[PDB]
Design a protein around this ligand. Structure first.
Ligand SMILES: Cc1cc2c(cc1C)N(C[C@H](O)[C@H](O)[C@H](O)COP(=O)(O)OP(=O)(O)OC[C@H]1O[C@@H](n3cnc4c(N)ncnc43)[C@H](O)[C@@H]1O)c1[nH]c(=O)[nH]c(=O)c1N2
Lengths: 364, 372, 376, 371
């Protein structure tokens, strides 16, 4: 930990101890029951894990993005579903309100988002850019449409919902929708291969009317807003891939050392060497992008490179962790099978690998 | 199909029909409930799938190994757990009895294995880290077995197990013997099925032998021949798992390519995107190569030629490929690929075991290298 | 071998002897001099390797395509450059004349192509146009009873040694994809100007030449097929071409692997033959497995083609797979050799250099993928 | 660059200018002739490139190891052979004398090594730790006999750090290190080896036949030879990591420019998704390789343990370089296989990085050992 700053090493310690004491012993159960207890979410709130990229005067704990990634790496090593909840809540639950909310808006919502009292959700994508619509009639914005894969959909108190307001690029607007609003209809959580305890829900909007002052930004600023947190999001998920890969690697190398022991059979040792090299490269790409972002510099390509690299790495590293365990690797009680299922999603959400490659290439 | 013989196409069509009518629509449920219905196993019996490498003379359906491979690829595309059952039963349930059994032993057990009335299992490996701790002592005209075995596929539904034990500890490599143990023999204790990431409906159980006393005539082959017997269906087992890996990959590939033709993003079917197209071509290439390696091994095996390397190449290749094709199949589905209801996530989970069992990839590589 | 037919074993035996006696011992020198002696090309002629896909009654030696792939793999295992020459001459030198030639045109040319008295070249690619092979700027105009070719061509294999070239030219510039025509052009024709062979990383003894056509006049009866049929003709030997390159990749890789496995048995490090080191043994096992899959893809495409069945996909899969496999196999061979792997005298560096072209010519990997995907 | 330091940016900018004006225009010709012009070596010396990990007090230009890695990357991108010479000279030419030499020894040789006046070589391995080359103390001199293998800079070096058995029966603690002037009678340098790549980096066998040197040329203590042989592994590996990053980067830069110029089916080929995907993968792996390499250098700069980290950088960069060079070939199509388009030289040069300064297999052993 010698190369990190003092802020960064403090977050790392706090994160480490939380993860060892609360996440790691319970993640198997949470996966098996597809459910993360709310008191664990609340406790993440109290510790500042749900406002790590909100400034401290708005109720958060932001220091820099390297710290953020270190915390999300630790949290993902303990529980990949927690890391999903946290990466989404901080980046796209908190980000839009902080960056485009008026002062009154931030007073209404941001301190509760940043403290974790209110969990946040972001809803842009749709089953088939958009067909969800919002009409302004009699002082209320009225939303009708259908939305897909909303992380934190069941538990969020607020949702940033994107909707077509003016059908002729600047045709979308963003809304803060409290999730108890009549006509905000959240469906049953999707059944997923992995991150099973991170609730991922479809949402139907059926004349969901919200006050006019719940418009977020100016009318027509929807797309820009939806795109304002790609760097933070991708950095977050790259950090998550790194943590999940690292957890499986930690188990593999512990199993190799105990099962001479198999860690000095050439082939096993080569896998472990490869796994360590790849995990460390993923971390360094993640941190490099986080430094640029901390400094306010352009870093979409760098963040997309981290997310790309870390995500693909993680599936291969988790696959080696299984292989190193033999027959036991396929068994639930040995946990690496969980890490393998959890890892897979990182290549898909927050921009697919194909999208990550498009943007990196665009800028060469 | 016009590339295959008459017999082969017939076995292929019979299995296609069974997988479409019975397996494919119910796989998802069986994965969900971690259980294959006894009657579906009995129906594979009735159809000859549980005797495909047993001569017709002994009640089986043997034509050749390519045909075996074709049937297993089809079963696997519909239900990976079914393929596991079928492949283990046929190769290591039926094989030891067929090759090493006396005539009377073949009459007492082989007809029922081949018909599928008796499901067979095979138990050599043990849960500690050749050098077995499980023992057999000859006492008053009976073999008495004491031991603990690990991961017996078909462990719960098998009526017979081939069970290997130390009979002569001084003799080392010739220290082992093989025994046919009816699973209802007192002292044959089946534990709870293991909880696995995939092939969840294939029962995999630890077993203990506790003063498990069996008739002297249940010794399979000669005393001390157990190792040799334990190693004599490696070719067949490995051919079948390579076929299974091929079928699993093919199911996910078929779902993904159909999805890529129907799904529209950026104003064209996604199969018209170059990156997607490249995955689809790589998938088809790798599946075809895996099938070609498998059938080449099968062809050598059918002609009684030595083929342990060719069988191991095919199993190594098909197993590694199946993970990469299934991963690609998930990716082409985007977020839907991660969803249970889109099924490719089941194919991925199921395929991962193929690199491990029937000899790990590491073991496969060792034999292939040994002959180079 | 037991799985092959008597014709297949016969050609296989013949190629093997030739490759040990003539090719393998001299290949290093030819790479070094960037030159294949004419007497070696004549011997391949005499032995029937330049007619392996022309029927016997036209002077060829065609039995089936599996035989062809076996012969090409051997030839390639001894000299990659030689395999390039053979593959091109057979598929696109002979093929166009065989398939589209009149009786008179086959009597004039195909017996000499099939015996190897005359080496064949194929010229389509231009400086601006490779993978997009239809937009041609080379032109052909009828004046005074002769076809007059003017233009510029690129990367012609066998370009300096060939006696005939199948040249593709725009006869009808406003007719697009139906505007190409194919022409048999004697390479001694005035205005058929062969540039100096390209300097390449690998297959350095396979002459690969630019060609300038300048008031290059030929008899009217050197038109091959119907006017406008050029594109169809240019695309009519894809399967055979790709089968042969797949077999070439397989043979180059095999040669690298044979050296590596022998060296790993002999070389000792940390008290045993490095072959017994598990990481080495794994590399060896992966190399065998991949070469074997390549071969089986190639022979499967060869069977469909022998039966006249459609097989462009299967041929493209073999080519893609073999070519990419060969790079990784030759790379493993280098690594198994340690620091000796980088040295010219240890040969495997040459196989690595030679292997790399197989992913590019006879349709790039990207093109192979497009056609495999399209036919799903 | 914003993220580098004033010294880092300083050495980077100088390496850039110099790669661009001297190295990159002439690298093809040097590869073709298998020869680096002496005056170019002298310019590297003069510019401080041959003293980059020796302190300023001893005639060097040492700032930190991140600066070293940046400069090696740039040199490598203009001329892989020059980078091989530079990496070796700094790491194992200067390193032993710097760290194990007496003050008298450092005054005698280290300043000339650091200024580039004298180029240094290092000679441990033989054709077959268990070594045949012997040194015998006789009449106030060490007399060396043996055969040595693949000495980089073997034909231009003025001094060679040679390792020999002083005490055959003490095994690993029976080796000693010696500073040998290369003009010493009985120091016979054979013909440079014929190689696939880095052809202008001279790589020579050396025969020592009754090669007699002063008693005071023992380096470190008698028996300390293996420890000295292993004392610059970190530096060496960081250097080759930077080499591999640079070679790949050169091929990458050519391929990405080509892709924006070459049109096929109506658009620049960089806009075909399959090419874009290659370019994106090349950029990402190259950056990953630099970041591993700089991470290692930071640990080295701070004097912290970093053998594994440098081994990870060297392993990752070297394997990466082959794959990136291969893509660069592919992106060029047929042109990629032609000498005039340069990417085929980069691919050839890149392949050595997986083998020397320890094979991939050796890198992976040290990484594993330490987990
Ligand atoms: C040694 C040797 C020998 C021969 C030949 C080449 C060489 C190097 N060829 C020519 C060969 O067929 C040619 O190199 C390929 O068609 C590739 O074309 P270019 O080199 O013009 O690359 P080109 O400019 O077409 O492509 C550059 C890169 O972009 C990619 N690309 C192009 N279009 C694309 C698309 N739509 N989507 C995705 N990617 C795309 C390609 O795959 C390639 O990777 C030939 N020719 C001949 O007529 N007669 C002969 O005998 C020979 N022999």
């Amino acid at each position: 930990d010698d190369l990190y700053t003092e802020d960064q090493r403090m977050i790392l310690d706090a994160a480490r101890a939380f993860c060892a004491e609360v996440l790691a012993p319970n993640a198997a159960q949470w996966d098996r029951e597809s459910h993360l207890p709310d008191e664990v979410v609340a406790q993440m709130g109290e510790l500042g894990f749900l406002g790590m990229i909100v400034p401290a005067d708005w109720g958060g704990s932001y220091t820099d993005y390297v710290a953020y990634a270190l915390a999300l790496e630790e949290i993902a090593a303990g529980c990949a579903s927690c890391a999903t909840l946290v990466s989404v809540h901080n980046s796209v639950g908190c980000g839009p309100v902080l960056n485009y909310g008026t002062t009154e808006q931030k007073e209404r919502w941001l301190r509760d988002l940043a403290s974790g009292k209110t969990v946040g959700a972001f809803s842009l994508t749709e089953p088939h850019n958009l067909r969800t619509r919002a009409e302004l009639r009699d002082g209320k914005w009225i939303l009708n449409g259908s939305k897909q894969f909303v992380t934190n959909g069941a538990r969020a108190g607020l949702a940033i919902v994107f909707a077509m307001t003016d059908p002729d690029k600047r045709g979308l607007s963003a809304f803060v929708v409290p999730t108890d609003t009549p006509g905000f209809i959240v469906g049953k959580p999707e059944k997923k291969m992995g991150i099973r305890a991170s609730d991922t829900c479809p949402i139907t909007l059926e004349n969901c009317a919200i006050p006019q002052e719940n418009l977020l930004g100016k009318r027509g600023e929807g797309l820009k807003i939806a795109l304002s947190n790609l760097e933070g999001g991708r950095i977050g998920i790259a950090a998550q891939a790194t943590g999940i890969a690292r957890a499986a690697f930690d188990r593999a190398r512990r199993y190799a050392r105990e099962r001479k022991p198999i860690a000095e059979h050439q082939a096993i040792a080569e896998k472990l060497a490869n796994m360590a090299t790849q995990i460390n490269a993923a971390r360094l790409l993640t941190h490099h992008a986080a430094r640029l972002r901390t400094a306010g510099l352009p870093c979409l390509s760098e963040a997309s490179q981290a997310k790309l690299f870390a995500s693909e790495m993680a599936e291969a590293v988790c696959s080696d962790a299984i292989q190193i365990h033999g027959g036991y690797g396929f068994l639930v009680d040995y946990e690496v099978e969980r890490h393998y299922r959890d890892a897979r999603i990182t290549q898909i959400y927050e921009g697919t690998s194909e999208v990550q490659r498009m943007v990196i290439a665009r800028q060469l």
